[PDB]
Design an enzyme around this catalytic site. Sequence first.
Site, PDB file in Angstrom:
ATOM      1  N   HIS A 145      -6.625  22.175   3.427  1.00  0.00           N
ATOM      2  CA  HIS A 145      -5.477  21.175   3.164  1.00  0.00           C
ATOM      3  C   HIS A 145      -4.832  21.590   1.885  1.00  0.00           C
ATOM      4  CE1 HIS A 145      -7.561  18.632   6.409  1.00  0.00           C
ATOM      5  NE2 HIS A 145      -6.171  18.787   6.800  1.00  0.00           N
ATOM      6  N   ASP A 188     -16.028  18.144  11.414  1.00  0.00           N
ATOM      7  CA  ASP A 188     -15.315  17.003  11.942  1.00  0.00           C
ATOM      8  C   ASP A 188     -14.787  16.836  13.303  1.00  0.00           C
ATOM      9  OD1 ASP A 188     -13.553  18.467  10.982  1.00  0.00           O
ATOM     10  OD2 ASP A 188     -12.700  17.371   9.425  1.00  0.00           O
ATOM     11  N   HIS A 230      -8.792  18.737  11.583  1.00  0.00           N
ATOM     12  CA  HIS A 230      -7.713  18.361  10.848  1.00  0.00           C
ATOM     13  C   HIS A 230      -6.933  19.739  10.756  1.00  0.00           C
ATOM     14  CE1 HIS A 230     -10.230  15.107   9.375  1.00  0.00           C
ATOM     15  NE2 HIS A 230      -9.190  14.515   9.328  1.00  0.00           N
ATOM     16  N   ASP A 275     -12.240   3.958  -2.746  1.00  0.00           N
ATOM     17  CA  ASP A 275     -11.116   4.648  -1.878  1.00  0.00           C
ATOM     18  C   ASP A 275     -11.451   4.679  -0.560  1.00  0.00           C
ATOM     19  OD1 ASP A 275      -8.875   5.788  -1.186  1.00  0.00           O
ATOM     20  OD2 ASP A 275      -9.286   7.499  -2.733  1.00  0.00           O
ATOM     21  N   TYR A 285     -18.321  14.948   8.422  1.00  0.00           N
ATOM     22  CA  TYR A 285     -18.610  13.877   7.633  1.00  0.00           C
ATOM     23  C   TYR A 285     -19.463  12.981   8.449  1.00  0.00           C
ATOM     24  CZ  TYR A 285     -14.396  15.483   5.419  1.00  0.00           C
ATOM     25  OH  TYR A 285     -13.534  16.694   4.836  1.00  0.00           O
ATOM     26  N   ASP A 312     -11.651  23.026  12.165  1.00  0.00           N
ATOM     27  CA  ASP A 312     -11.764  21.801  11.763  1.00  0.00           C
ATOM     28  C   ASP A 312     -10.923  20.728  12.454  1.00  0.00           C
ATOM     29  OD1 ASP A 312     -10.283  19.512   9.664  1.00  0.00           O
ATOM     30  OD2 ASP A 312     -12.562  19.900   8.808  1.00  0.00           O
TER      31      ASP A 312
END
Length: 624
Positions: free
Chosen positions: A136, A266, A175, A21, A306, A173
Site C-alpha cells: 500500500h 488476510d 487488499h 485507533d 491479522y 493479500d
Amino acid sequence: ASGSALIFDEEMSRYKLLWTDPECEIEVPERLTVSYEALRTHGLAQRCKAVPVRQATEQEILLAHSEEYLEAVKQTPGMNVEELMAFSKKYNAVYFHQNIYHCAKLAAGATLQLVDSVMKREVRNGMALVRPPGHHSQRSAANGFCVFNNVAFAALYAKKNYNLNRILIVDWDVHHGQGIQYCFEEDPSVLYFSWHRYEHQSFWPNLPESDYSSVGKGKGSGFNINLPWNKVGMTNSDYLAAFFHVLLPVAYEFDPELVIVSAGFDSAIGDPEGEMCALPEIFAHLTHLLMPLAAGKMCVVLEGGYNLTSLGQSVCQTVHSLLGDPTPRISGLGTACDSALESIQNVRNVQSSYWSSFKHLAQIVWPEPLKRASVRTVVVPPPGVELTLPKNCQHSGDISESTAKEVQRIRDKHFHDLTDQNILRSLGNIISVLDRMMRSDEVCNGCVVVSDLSVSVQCALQHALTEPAERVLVVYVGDGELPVKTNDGKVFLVQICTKKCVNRLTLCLESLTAGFMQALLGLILPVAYEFNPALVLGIVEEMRVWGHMTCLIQGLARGRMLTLLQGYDKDLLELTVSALSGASISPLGPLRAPKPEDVEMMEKQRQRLQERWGLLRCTVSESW
Ligand SMILES: NCc1ccc(C(=O)CS)cc1
Ligand SMILES: [K+]
Ligand SMILES: [K+]
Ligand SMILES: [Zn+2]
C-alpha cells in the site's frame, strides 16, 4: 542453487500503535512473532538459510519514494506521542512509531537481502518475515500499515542490479496494493497481478483503479491485472480458479525471470479484514503453482494477515511449499462462485486485447492443517544401467518375497504364458515402489522404465487401487487406448495424443508447447485439483518439456506421482527424475499464443467438461 532463505529479525517487532485507533488495531507486533514461532514449532525455520536483516540505504529507499517523503519519515524517530499522532493523521490507515522508520528500513533491507540471496544463486527461493508491510505504500505517502513499499523495492532492485527485464509480482493479500500498481502501471517489465476484496469499490482502499478495468497505462498496458472479489467468503475454489484461469496463463506466457510474492495472509479463513474462507493449505499450492516460474526463484514477502492462527498456519504452508515439501491435498474443490466467475470473466475479457489467450468467440474455527519423505524419489532404470542421480534418489530394486509372490499371483491370474524375467522384474519394481510411496511414506514420487506398456499399466493401476487409493489421475502421453476402465469414476484419464466420456480428456495438440501449456494451466490442472486423486500415474511411450507438468501435477496426491517410461531415453529419464526430485525446472521461454485449431479444441473440451468439473468454468453459466 539450493536452499530456502528465511530473513527475519525481532527488531521489526519493536514498534506498535501508541494510541487508540480501531483502523489500525489489527496490525500488532505479535503477528511477526507468531509467524516465526510457528516456523520454529514445525522445524521449518531450522531447515532455512537464515540470511541476516540489513537496513535499506537512502538510495535504495529513493528507488520507489521521493526525497520529500523520505525526509518526512526520517524525522519520525524524534517525535513524542502527540507529534506521532499528528503525523500519522496526515496519511490513510497508518500509525507511526519512534522505531517504525528503523523497522521499515529493516523490512526493505530484508526484502533486498532475499532478492540478493535468490538472484546470486545462494538459495533457490525464500521468504521475508517483515513488518511493516509495503504494497500500500506509495511514492510520497504512507498508506494501509505501510511506510515503504518492500515489494516495489524488490522489483526495482532486481531490475537495476541484476538487469532483469521480466519480473512477476503476485499480490494475494486481500487488499489491493495501489502502491505497487502505481509504481509499475506504465512499466511493462514488471507484471503485477493482485487479487483483492473490492465489493464494488465499497471496501478499502475504495479505489476505481482497483477494478478489472485497470490494465496498465501506455507501454505497460496489459501488465497490470486486478482481480476484484465483489463478495466475501471466497473459498479455495475461487482462488484456484483465479490462478488457473487468470494468473498462471499470463504468467507462463510472460515467462518471468523472477517471481516476488506480496504474501499477505488476510486472504485466509478467519481473518477479520478479508472475511474469506480460504484454508491456509491453499497458500502451499499457490506457492507451488508459481514455483516452475523463474527457475524457482521466488521471493515471498510478508504483507497482511491479522488472524494470528491462520497467519501462522499460512506462513507454515508457504514455507513448507518453498522447501519442497509434499503439498497438502485439497478436498471439496468445485466451481468458483458466480461473483468470482464474473470477476474472472471481466478481467479475462478486458485483458484479452493484451494476452490473446483470453480472447473469446461471440455468443470462526477450521480444522488444523495436516503435518506436511526420507527418499523423495526412487528410480528403476533398465536392469544394468547406472546414472548420476540427485542426492534424494534411490535405485530401489529391493524386491521382497511377498512382492514376488504377488507378482506370481497376478501373472497366474491375468497374464498367463508371460514368462519374461525382465518385465516381471519391472512389475515387481512397480509394486515395491507403489507400496513404498502409498503406505510406507518413505518415498514421495517414483519413476520406472518399462518395455511392455500394456501389462505394466494394468499392474500399476490395479495395485494402486488395491492399496489405499480412492482416486487415480492417469496422465498418458501418446496414442492408443490403454487398458484403463474410465467409467467407475475412481480413475480419470488425460491422454495427450496426436490423432465421449466425462471421466476422460483427450488432447490432440512449434506452438504445441504453448498449446500444451495453456491446456495444462486451464484444463488439466483444474480437473486434477477437483478430482483430488490419491495417486498420479504418468505414462510415456515411443520434443516435449513435460517437467513443468511433472512439477505442477505434484500438487496433487500429496506429491505421489509414479512415472512409467516405455523405452529408455537418458535425457527424458533425467528430466522426469529431476522434476520429481524437486529441482528447478528450466524455463519454457516466452510462449506465444497457440494456434487457432488448438484453441478451438481446448474450448470444446472445456465446454464438454464444465458441467461435471466446474473448476474449468472461467465464465458465468447461462441458465437454460
Ligand atoms: N482499516 C483500514 C485498513 C488498511 C489496511 C489494511 C491491511 O491489511 C494492509 S495489507 C487493513 C485495514
Ligand atoms: K492483492
Ligand atoms: K505493470
Ligand atoms: Zn492486506
